[PDB]
């Protein structure tokens, strides 16, 4: 009984996973480029910051 | 007074000693330099024992750098270097000081290493903590400073001495005394250079090493062989050191005691007192080549390092 | 800013106060020896635990000749142990217990030993081995009706040891068996291992009390061997 | 090499071609 | 009955494979190549903090980007001031086996776990002038591996007994329990919108979990061996995973696929802990060969290596302002890079 | 994903001969140490035989020391166990296990109640 219930739950989870509306990878890659180009300027570790701003030197 | 036959050094002995020194110089250079390179090159290798090994290595290296060239020059030629210039004055003021400093360094480092190995073998602890403890650095720096301070009497002791022999006049440099302290230094030198550099090191490295061997030598079957091997290796070093350093002190004490001024055949004795002296210096460099040689036949971990 | 200055001074005082207690705790951490007590169900671990105790995670702390010992056993976990096994890499030496009689579940024990002796975080730790239940071994072998060759076919041609320490109340069969098993465990420990850790076997029974001095001797041997490898002295 | 006599020219000569020690 | 269940499970697997295939349009490598190269971002070391005995297992930066906290195997928790390189609060531990620690998002609570299958919470802001243990939570059947807050009253715990749970401090019980991994779970990270999160487990799969409903939303495959590092992208629509096979990978929740793999050839030891950056351009990982790496996200190249650790590295973390990163290895030291 | 499926099993007359082959897909086959696991009715799991990474070191168990031959196939990504001169004492469910960590010389937990790298297995009757 327990094994049958566990198998039913697992296959139900598999069915829910299969029936998922997914957006193509191209839009996701475009979104990643959008976030990178939007926030590149505010990242101190991305580009060498002026030595007068780093609180660790 | 004058001597019917005047003393000399034979050419064959000069060639033999020169070739022996030439053979020994490069080995003394290379082994010690190779040992020194690995300790500071490798990041993970540095700990307590490497500090003492490196200090002993550096002292030995300074000794080999100093002793051989000027002695071989005095064997080949007969003039002190730059005798007619002030540079020779500076050389005969500086070289003995640095030589005595190096010898003090090597002997004291041997004693310290023997003292530390016993604490390594017979203490309920796991010696660890890659880096350098305070005590080890303090010991090393104190050893070096005391060694350098224990050679000033040799430093300011040597002057050019006028003299005329057989008609000709030459320029020798020797420990001419001008003060009461230097007079006492001249009066008791051979016994001091014998005692402090022979007696105390043998006593220390024998007492501490027999104390270590008592616990080390006395599952079990597979380890008894290793304990025997290490005991034999550590006891070989004391015998090697004693037999290699004895003849120089023997020649000095024989010259200081037996030689008589009123004797007529004393020149012959002086002859016998010359050659042996040179031999001693050769044997001295034997202690600047054997300690690095031991590690290649002992650890089997330094074997790969030496190969690399 | 004077308030700020004295605040910074007080913060430095706090740092010093922390450092003092840290040193006082370091002085005590390094003078204790901690061991693992791995075993199986058919073996007997509780008997040894009581023997060295009469003198999720359960602990036994004892002391011999003014040396302190801490000992850990893990019973609250699940079956798999591939992940919490790596919490033990500074342990001075592991302890392993195997039942010498129940011959069906012998091979399994051997397998575990191999995994202890061949790893990444466990390749620098020594092992103390205890073959327990000697009386059952002697009784079962002497009574017959149990062939060793049924489970280990390479026992019939086994040669008796060249040397041994047999008690006067022993017969050739019991010594033969109890040395075949010990060499069976010892063969794995000598195939691999580049002279960094060793194995130290003993024989023990339920009615035994001197199982704490063996620990002292083993630990001293381990520490001495580990010390002589740092000072380059073989 | 050092002997406290400078008139004993034999000792001086020995001091001349002896090692520095 | 079991045969029919297996047959329909295989049919569902085929359907899910078809659904994954249909969503595939083009590779990320070709479409990311048009971007200008990031360039060398070689970094250096800064203030180094000392005073630990055994190895380290966890570290969490904080929110204001000025404090931090670290846990060690002598039962020692220590809270460090990064700016002035000092100590403020050092606390002992009841059980000498501690595996994961964490810092509260409010900068007021410190959470510790370990092998006792119990979680302890420490209130830094005390009314009696000392750190004291106020709450501990129990109910698991195995070793803990993470405890990360949502607020001052919610925490999500992951245990080696194949379960995670959401707790409430006031009641000290389990409101909801997430089950269904069939293995051991190691590391979890929340989301910037504080609505969903993920669980990485030894079953060679990752999962997405939601807090309110409770049921798992989706599952991800791709890695072979045990997974032991996970984090979240700043946007909340991506996550990068690191496992024992010495291969890091990236997943996008919307596409429900695997996008890019960061591999190499002279790497044979697996990852242990990873983190992301501010702009989403730097991705930091710690490995077993005593060296740590900093990769770039959009492209598939590595430019920048952190070295200086003797033993294996365990903890790594970026700040909430991008100012620096912290790293700790199995040699009782913590190094801060900028 | 990771998959391992076995092939073989059936009724065997005494003193018979068979071969059991487990195929795998989802990982690089030339970096993993694998073995075999047995379960007879009324008892727990047990170990039988194992191969190393390059097909060089082999090992078995004493109960079957002169009747079994195990061999891998890296080209075809399969594992085989060949059974000859069987015995009535063997009638069990057979599993094709897998050791977790690549590039290593040991593996724990090959025999466990739940492992998640273990195939479904077959059942043989003698």
CSV table of C-alpha atoms in Angstrom, one decimal, chain C residues 149 152-160 176 180, chain F residues 65:
chain,number,residue,atom,x,y,z
C,149,UNK,CA,37.0,-24.2,3.7
C,152,UNK,CA,37.3,-19.7,2.6
C,153,UNK,CA,38.7,-22.4,0.3
C,154,UNK,CA,42.3,-21.3,0.9
C,155,UNK,CA,42.5,-22.6,4.5
C,156,UNK,CA,43.2,-26.3,4.0
C,157,UNK,CA,46.6,-25.7,2.6
C,158,UNK,CA,47.4,-23.0,5.2
C,159,UNK,CA,50.7,-23.4,7.1
C,160,UNK,CA,50.8,-23.0,10.8
C,176,UNK,CA,45.7,-22.5,13.1
C,180,UNK,CA,44.6,-17.7,9.6
F,65,UNK,CA,35.8,-18.9,-5.7
